[PDB]
Amino acid sequence: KIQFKEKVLWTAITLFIFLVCCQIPLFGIMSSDSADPFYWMRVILASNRGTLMELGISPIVTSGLIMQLLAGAKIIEVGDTPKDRALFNGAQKLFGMIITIGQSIVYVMTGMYGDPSEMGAGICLLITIQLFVAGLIVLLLDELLQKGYGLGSGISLFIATNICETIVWKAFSPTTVNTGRGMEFEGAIIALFHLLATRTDKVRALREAFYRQNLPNLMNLIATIFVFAVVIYFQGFRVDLPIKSARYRGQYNTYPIKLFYTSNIPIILQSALVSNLYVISQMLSARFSGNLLVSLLGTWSDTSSGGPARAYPVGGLCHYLSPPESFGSVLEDPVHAVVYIVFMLGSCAFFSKTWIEVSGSSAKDVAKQLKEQQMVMRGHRETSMVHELNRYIPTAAAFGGLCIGALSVLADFLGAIGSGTGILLAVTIIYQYFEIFVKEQSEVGSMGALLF
Template identity: 70%
Template sequence: MGFRFLTLIRPFMGIIPEVAAPDRKVAFNQKVLWTVITLLVFLVLSQVPLYGIMSSDSSDPLYWMRVILASNRGTLMEFGITPIITSGMIMQLLAGAQIISVDYSLREDRALFSGAQKLFAMLITFGSATVAVMTGQYGDPTSLGAGICLLLIIQLFVAGVIVILLDEMLQKGYGLGSGINLFIATNICEDIVWKSLSPLTVNNGKGPEFEGAIIAFFHLLFVRSNKFMAVYEALTRSTLPNLTNLVATVLVFAVVIYLQGFRVEIPIKSARFRGHRASYPIKLFYTSNMPRHYAHETVAT
């Protein structure tokens, strides 16, 4: 039954979009270039709003998860990397539980399994887009009309396919690192930079203040006569990003980078060559952010 499942994927392989593997080793400078291009495309998709929406101010059930899902509400990156993670996790669990059989030593099985993951991710993207539009996440479907609803679904689906192909391009060696991790890191860095240097002003009753924590710090020092209170306000303001948030974020980054260097050396010996000993290093953060993704998918399901 397992092999039959992969056989069922074969007719779709001709229509599933695919990034061709490089026919020669990709130079490092080219990898850097392709990585930068990929991240620029992702950033553009994260900022382009969906055309045709009436409102995206309804409650957001994924608000606290959008950081690790690399998604942005009301934009082409509404679903972020969710379809990729969901399809990959489900397919890996099915293969690991031997519900579907995959022989990774066979090139055809590897290709079919990869194609199944992409097809499943595309179906999840289309299904999620349809549900989001028809449940009124962007406005009442009857008020939007059939044409706008269809246009919204197409926008979300095409953007999802682009992200899938960008991730595949990096995985096949055109870029540096994993697409999923790069998208998450880019989304987080964009948020940090914006909340630190945003030039937008907000009036919260005490006069206009800059949204960016660093810009607000210098602005408060300039406009407040009491410099001590200006520094205190820049460190502790609760309605907008403050310097304490920024310092805490930098400290967390430093601790994580430091702990990334920790590893456990597991001694191993060869059964074929007697007396041959070696060690297998396992990083302290071996599982990375996957437990959070698994927890999210379990709760969401």
């Protein structure tokens, strides 16, 4: 039944699965390899999900990498094949959903390889079923979110929840600390003010260089502040052009654009996806196939290594598209800095344009809706009413995404979080969902709708 109460419950079940997920998926302990890789991989994956190792929610967005890449390549060659490639944008997304269960699952495991698999013993059994159940429930709900069941806030919401949750856990965990303050509050050593306050009060200000002492903790806070000031500036900015709206006859509503903002969602998505693609392929190439020269198989298969850091490949395209492993405290490499900004930017803009086609917002889709309510025919124009918003949709979309992918790379440089991925993508999602939640709801407010 249609009814807002039914919709909130469907979100609530999905959310409950996430909460349920927070125990389970890990393997926990025994032996084997299920547990989570490195720097990029965790953000997608979402939260704390078996204590330190976050195994669960990774596959859904992983399928979304397949969606973007091909669509902008826009194959024409081979006649029967281009039609299949065009269809692929939707049809592949389901095939991709199959590939991620089939093939991503080895990639999800591999990074925290704990001690070798095939160790054996009866021990696990319940773990073998729980992983199988996880595959069944999350995959079923993912299908239901793309074709009829949700509310506002499906897939994005877990990322939205995850960032806030991650910040408290990093703040409130073991690592290096001399002594607790003697108030551990609701768990460990919570907000950073408590951590500073240990002995007596104060002493943060004393240090080397007016940073060093409490710099890893400090760096995390500033990361948020840098994003905080700039994010709101562009969210506030609006494109007008609704002009004459409401059929003519007098009573009217101005219509806000989706425009630059709708194109913004593919770029923010891009920074997450692009990094994924290189690492999975780099892992695949070594495992699958022998290897003369490093460079010969591929660039980014160039110098596949455990390297200095979790950031495996020390050479190739993948190297540039990861931080220099100091988060901008060394930028006097150059080759690395130059490639990182430019490469991401052009790839993002390409993906902004593919959002237009049949996967998101284009002028033709808008046009039919406008007639139904009668929008004033976009002040006529004849062949207009379609030219108005149509000409300004590729220009707005291409630009719309373009800025942000540069800014994301610069955010790492300015003063990244300790994970250096996980807060950064996730914060961008957290603002976004508030807009989706209430404006779509039509029930004019901003108040409750949690279970209402």
